[PDB]
Each structure stands twice: as structure tokens, then as C-alpha cells.
Design an enzyme around this catalytic site. Structure first.
Site, PDB file in Angstrom:
ATOM      1  N   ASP A  28       0.805  -1.232   0.000  1.00  0.00           N
ATOM      2  CA  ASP A  28       0.000   0.000   0.000  1.00  0.00           C
ATOM      3  C   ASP A  28       0.835   1.278   0.000  1.00  0.00           C
ATOM      4  OD1 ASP A  28       0.779   0.430   2.673  1.00  0.00           O
ATOM      5  OD2 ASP A  28      -1.181  -0.059   3.509  1.00  0.00           O
ATOM      6  N   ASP A 138      -0.002  -9.651   8.571  1.00  0.00           N
ATOM      7  CA  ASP A 138       0.003  -9.218   7.184  1.00  0.00           C
ATOM      8  C   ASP A 138       1.439  -8.843   6.846  1.00  0.00           C
ATOM      9  OD1 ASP A 138      -1.239  -8.813   4.751  1.00  0.00           O
ATOM     10  OD2 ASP A 138      -2.409  -7.072   5.425  1.00  0.00           O
TER      11      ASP A 138
END
Length: 179
Positions: A28, A138
Site C-alpha cells: 500500500d 500481514d
């Protein structure tokens, strides 16, 4: 039976006495929840895009809290060891079980991450995600560092460990260091 960690009496998946975690990979390019980039920007330090760094599920990230900036467990390191398991249809078995150490530099909030990070208590409280794990990691993959492990959302055992010296030095420049 693709998941090899069996739920205990409290629903927590474990393996050979050790707690398991689920994993995914993300990208991201944000600085992240531990402030690992220059202050006031949304620009991560390159190392925080390149190295073995993680965004754990929120309740581990903040040790039971809901803080998404300078969570209690920013800068902790976790050793993740594949079991050979995975969630059916949502991962696969990795080519080897070499352990890898990741540093916590970001958070996986409950909001927007129900399946994997929707865990309503910290590890030790018998709260699990939708797949039966007490915590989720994650894994940052911006430069293919998880692809290079050939990890496709593996099931792992997890433990906190002292950070390797290079990661410890990296963390010193995050804004949350000494917060």
C-alpha cells in the site's frame, strides 16, 4: 484438512504446544502505524518497504487496545515458522519451512479486514479470527520479499523474539521509538 493447527478447547489453533497465526501479504506504500518514515509525511523509509516487516491484527498490535498510532507492540519482532498448512482456497503449502523473523511496523485494523484481522481480543484471551487463529500477520511485499520466500498465506507458529540488530537499528528511526 489443509489447516494443520488443531483448535484447542477454547477454539485457538495450536501446533505442537505453540500458538498458530494466519498470514497474508500486502502492499500500500504508506508510512504505517509505527511512524517508520520521516515525520509528518506519509513516506516510509525504504527499509520499511524492503525488509521483513509486518502489520499484525489490531488487538496484538496494541496489546488489547485500539490505538492505530504507536501501538504497544510497534517494533517487536516475531519469528514465524510455517507448519505446512494453509486455509483451503486461501493459500497453499510453501516449498520449505524455514523460519523468518518480521518486525512490527504497521497495523492491520479490524475495520476493513474482518476475515483475517477481526479478532476481538489480544493473544491469551481465546479470541480468534474467522479461521481460528489468535493473531494474524500481514506481511509487507512491496518489493517481492514475501514472493521470494514463496509464501502463499502459510499457516505458521509464532513467537516474539529479540529483533536482529539491523532491524533494531532501523526501528530507532521510527517516530514511535520511545513513545
Amino acid at each position: 484438512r489443509a489447516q494443520l493447527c488443531q483448535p484447542d478447547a477454547h477454539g485457538v489453533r495450536r501446533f505442537n504446544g505453540r500458538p498458530c497465526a494466519s498470514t497474508t501479504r500486502y502492499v500500500d506504500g504508506h508510512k504505517g502505524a509505527c511512524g517508520c518514515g520521516q515525520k509528518g509525511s506519509d513516506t516510509p523509509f525504504p527499509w520499511n518497504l524492503q525488509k521483513h516487516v509486518t502489520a499484525p491484527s489490531e488487538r496484538y498490535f496494541d496489546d488489547g487496545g485500539s490505538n492505530l498510532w504507536c501501538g504497544k507492540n510497534c517494533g517487536k519482532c516475531v519469528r514465524l515458522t510455517p507448519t505446512g498448512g494453509f486455509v483451503p482456497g486461501k493459500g497453499g503449502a510453501p516449498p520449505n519451512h524455514n523460519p523468518v523473523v518480521f518486525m512490527v511496523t504497521n497495523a492491520c485494523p479490524i475495520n476493513g479486514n474482518e476475515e483475517w484481522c477481526g479478532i476481538s481480543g489480544k493473544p491469551g484471551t481465546n479470541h480468534v479470527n474467522s479461521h481460528g487463529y489468535e493473531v494474524h500477520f500481514d506481511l509487507q511485499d512491496q518489493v517481492g520479499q514475501v514472493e521470494a520466500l514463496h509464501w502463499d498465506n502459510p499457516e505458521v507458529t509464532w513467537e516474539e523474539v529479540p529483533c536482529p540488530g539491523d532491524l533494531q537499528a532501523n526501528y530507532q528511526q521510527c517516530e514511535c521509538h520511545n513513545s
